[PDB]
Amino acid sequence: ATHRLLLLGAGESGKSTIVKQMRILHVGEKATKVQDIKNNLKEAIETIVAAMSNLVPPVELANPENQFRVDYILSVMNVPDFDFPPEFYEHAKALWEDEGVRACYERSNEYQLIDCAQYFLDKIDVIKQDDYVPSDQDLLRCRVLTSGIFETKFQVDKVNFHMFDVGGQRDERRKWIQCFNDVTAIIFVVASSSYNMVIREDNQTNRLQEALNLFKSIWNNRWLRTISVILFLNKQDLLAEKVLAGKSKIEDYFPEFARYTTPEDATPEPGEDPRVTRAKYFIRDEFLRISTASGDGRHYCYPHFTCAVDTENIRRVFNDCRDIIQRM
Amino acid sequence: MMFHKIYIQKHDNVSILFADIEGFTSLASQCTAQELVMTLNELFARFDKLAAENHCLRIKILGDCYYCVSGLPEARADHAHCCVEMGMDMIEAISLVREMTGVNVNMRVGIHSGRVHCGVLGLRKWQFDVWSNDVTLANHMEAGGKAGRIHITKATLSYLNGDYEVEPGCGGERNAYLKEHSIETFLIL
Amino acid sequence: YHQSYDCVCVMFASIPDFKEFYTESDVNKEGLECLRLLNEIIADFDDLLSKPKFSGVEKIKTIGSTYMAATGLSAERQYMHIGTMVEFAYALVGKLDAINKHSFNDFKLRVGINHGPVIAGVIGAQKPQYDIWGNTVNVASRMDSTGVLDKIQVTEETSLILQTLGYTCTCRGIINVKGKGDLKTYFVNT
Ligand SMILES: Nc1nc2c(ncn2[C@@H]2O[C@H](COP(=O)(O)OP(=O)(O)OP(O)(O)=S)[C@@H](O)[C@H]2O)c(=O)[nH]1
Ligand SMILES: C=C[C@@]1(C)CC(=O)[C@]2(O)[C@@]3(C)[C@@H](O)CCC(C)(C)[C@@H]3[C@H](O)[C@H](OC(C)=O)[C@@]2(C)O1
Ligand SMILES: [Cl-]
Ligand SMILES: [Cl-]
Ligand SMILES: [Mg+2]
Numbered sequence: 001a002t003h004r005l006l007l008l009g010a011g012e013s014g015k016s017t018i019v020k021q022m023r024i025l026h027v028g029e030k031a032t033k034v035q036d037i038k039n040n041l042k043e044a045i046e047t048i049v050a051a052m053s054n055l056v057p058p059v060e061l062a063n064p065e066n067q068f069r070v071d072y073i074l075s076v077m078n079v080p081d082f083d084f085p086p087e088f089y090e091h092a093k094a095l096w097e098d099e100g101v102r103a104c105y106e107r108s109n110e111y112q113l114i115d116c117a118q119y120f121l122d123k124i125d126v127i128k129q130d131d132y133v134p135s136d137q138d139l140l141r142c143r144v145l146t147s148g149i150f151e152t153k154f155q156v157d158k159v160n161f162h163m164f165d166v167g168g169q170r171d172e173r174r175k176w177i178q179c180f181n182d183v184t185a186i187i188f189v190v191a192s193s194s195y196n197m198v199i200r201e202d203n204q205t206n207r208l209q210e211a212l213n214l215f216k217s218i219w220n221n222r223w224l225r226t227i228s229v230i231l232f233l234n235k236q237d238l239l240a241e242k243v244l245a246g247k248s249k250i251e252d253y254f255p256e257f258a259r260y261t262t263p264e265d266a267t268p269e270p271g272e273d274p275r276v277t278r279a280k281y282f283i284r285d286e287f288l289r290i291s292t293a294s295g296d297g298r299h300y301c302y303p304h305f306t307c308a309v310d311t312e313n314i315r316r317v318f319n320d321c322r323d324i325i326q327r328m
Numbered sequence: 329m330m331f332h333k334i335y336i337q338k339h340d341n342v343s344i345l346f347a348d349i350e351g352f353t354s355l356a357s358q359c360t361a362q363e364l365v366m367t368l369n370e371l372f373a374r375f376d377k378l379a380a381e382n383h384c385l386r387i388k389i390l391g392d393c394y395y396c397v398s399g400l401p402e403a404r405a406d407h408a409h410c411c412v413e414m415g416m417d418m419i420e421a422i423s424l425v426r427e428m429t430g431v432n433v434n435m436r437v438g439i440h441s442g443r444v445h446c447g448v449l450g451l452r453k454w455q456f457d458v459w460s461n462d463v464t465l466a467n468h469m470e471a472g473g474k475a476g477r478i479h480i481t482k483a484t485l486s487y488l489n490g491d492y493e494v495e496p497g498c499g500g501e502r503n504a505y506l507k508e509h510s511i512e513t514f515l516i517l
Numbered sequence: 518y519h520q521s522y523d524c525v526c527v528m529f530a531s532i533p534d535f536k537e538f539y540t541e542s543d544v545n546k547e548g549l550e551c552l553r554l555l556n557e558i559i560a561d562f563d564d565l566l567s568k569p570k571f572s573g574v575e576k577i578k579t580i581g582s583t584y585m586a587a588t589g590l591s592a593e594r595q596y597m598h599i600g601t602m603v604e605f606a607y608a609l610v611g612k613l614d615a616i617n618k619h620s621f622n623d624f625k626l627r628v629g630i631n632h633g634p635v636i637a638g639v640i641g642a643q644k645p646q647y648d649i650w651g652n653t654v655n656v657a658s659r660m661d662s663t664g665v666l667d668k669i670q671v672t673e674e675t676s677l678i679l680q681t682l683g684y685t686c687t688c689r690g691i692i693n694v695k696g697k698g699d700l701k702t703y704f705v706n707t
């Protein structure tokens with residue numbers, strides 16, 4: 001038996017991260033990813049710094065000295081093959097400890113910043129070492145853009161799985177079609193936490209809305225009429241964090257939230273704040289409303305609360321997926 | 329059925345030949361629509377005869393473009409030879425019609441070998457056809473060929489087992505596609 | 518056998534971006550998945566021929582990802598078919614837009630239309646494939662090959678007949694068309 005799984009979703013939703021877990025779970029080497037981790041680091045610090053003056057209102061530095069460090073980062077920003085001298089890390093580290101820069105970090109939904117920003121900036125002293133060895137979590141956080149289609153083959157209890165990873169940005173979606181025919185099932189990934197952000201493509205369209213519209217076009221697609229969709233409501237850790245933080249209200253982006261009350265059949269985790277329960281289930285339902293409205297019997301939608309960088313959770317949810325695929 | 333049924337199948341180790349008349353739009357402007365068709369029916373009927381003999385399978389006729397494939401429907405290791413032979417008979421056929429009709433008809437022949445997908449597309453007016461980069465390339469060989477000669481690729485040369493005397497084709501200098509794709513071409517003697 | 522014609526409207530509708538969409542990889546079965554999408558597109562265009570308002574439209578063939586058709590082969594009530602061809606062009610655009618919505622693509626059509634004398638029949642010696650020939654057919658093709666995305670380019674003669682039917686045209690200017698020379702062409706207004 002051979003199952004062909006197609007990963008779909010908007011850009012930065014977590015599709016590539018899911019594939020990375022499959023290798024970790026079911027499959028000179030990882031030294032090539034060091035450079036990629038270092039790029040994410042340079043990308044994160046330069047984006048926060050360059051964003052300070054453009055915000056409205058503009059965020060100011062807490063330390064005058066750091067202005068020179070700001071000048072340093074912006075001057076090396078466009079450098080092609082950067083050598084990463086030890087000065088760079090000292091500058092990056094200094095800037096990341098400046099409270100002004102952190103205030104600008106808290107407002108990152110107002111601009112375009114990668115997800116692994118805080119994770120790496122907090123590990124500068126680790127990444128800078130010559131004898132640095134990327135941990136498993138480091139490889140899971142590393143962000144590199146997907147262009148083209150990529151097949152990852154693996155086995156779970158002698159059962160074969162062919163997983164296809166695709167680019168999720170607008171211009172990349174035109175290739176998806178090349179994987180529609182003879183697909184066992186689709187796994188749709190959504191950045192549940194990106195409700196207060198806009199997509200890169202135009203800098204205006206809300207990320208969640210884009211995911212919602214993308215789901216509607218997949219669910220109601222003419223060529224996937226009988227194809228089921230396993231829905232990964234990803235980035236649950238970041239959702240919970242934002243919800244509890246109380247600074248960016250969900251109902252200021254999706255007004256309908258103000259009417260929403262947690263369902264009866266809801267199954268929260270142990271000790272989970274009812275506020276987080278409410279938010280995660282609301283997002284879930286916005287997707288179910290679309291799947292509920294059509295198909296009927298031809299195909300079904302199976303949602304799951306996930307966190308792609310958490311290997312435990314992925315083992316758990318993918319095993320749930322195996323039960324869904326085999327039963328029917 | 330999500331997608332309509334596709335009547336297409338892949339075939340490796342095949343040779344594609346393209347023949348095209350020079351200045352067809354120019355030629356059609358001068359002579360009658362009636363006589364053009366007679367000169368073309370005379371030419372293509374003969375081509376279709378030569379094709380069955382040389383074991384080539386004619387695909388379509390696009391006004392002045394004539395193309396066939398050797399190695400279909402069943403595999404044949406004699407393929408590259410067939411297409412080369414087919415072009416030989418073609419060029420000679422055009423010469424007889426040039427004199428018999430007194431019309432200025434000239435063609436360029438292009439040959440390439442590789443894999444092709446063949447079959448039909450659509451629901452109505454089915455016509456057997458071939459598609460692939462190799463077919464695309466074969467088409468450009470005709471465009472980058474020379475009047476009254478057979479322009480072949482390195483790939484086609486490797487299937488010919490050295491049975492034909494060739495000379496440097498320099499296809500890269502007459503067609504942008506052949507150059508940008510670093511294709512080595514040869515003209516058959 | 519063959520029959521001569523006096524007023525047939527020929528149309529070439531290309532999809533110039535398809536060639537770039539086409540690729541060969543182990544993931545796409547060496548271009549088979551791309552040919553599958555082209556099959557859906559061509560099929561969607563074929564289903565239009567079943568519309569009553571298009572009973573006069575005769576599909577001649579497909580050249581790659583290009584669609585070729587004609588009207589008046591079943592023969593200004595005498596020039597009506599020319600307007601039917603243009604309507605058929607707009608319909609193809611509607612079908613191609615539908616395809617774009619579902620395949621997350623942005624294919625645009627480039628149409629060329631002309632009319633005049635043609636010769637209908639079958640040539641060759643292997644299979645009975647109906648086709649049309651003539652200078653008229655050549656110019657229609659040039660109208661496509663020298664056209665613009667999302668536009669219907671027509672010859673001067675065609676723009677005139679189209680004007681008496683209610684269509685309005687914009688002069689593209691005088692362009693040197695290979696084999697013909699300086700031809701004044703037009704774009705049908707939407
Ligand atoms: N905190 C957190 N980060 C996550 C989670 N899932 C993915 N990420 C991070 O988000 C980033 C983007 O994920 P990625 O998998 O690269 O996106 P993608 O869907 O493949 O993106 P693309 O190729 O369409 S442009 C990565 O840095 C990844 O580590 C999650 O559940 N929690
Ligand atoms: C369908 C895609 C693709 C790439 C496949 C292919 O091999 C072709 O169909 C050939 C070469 C091929 O089918 C042989 C006939 C002809 C008419 C020469 C084609 C066109 O040049 C196509 O391009 C156009 C412009 O339609 C092209 C190149 O398109
Ligand atoms: Cl998303
Ligand atoms: Cl684990
Ligand atoms: Mg990716």
Ligand SMILES: [Mg+2]
Pocket residue numbers: 348349350351352392
């Ligand atoms: Mg020619």
Ligand SMILES: [Mg+2]
Pocket residue numbers: 348352392393
């Ligand atoms: Mg030609």
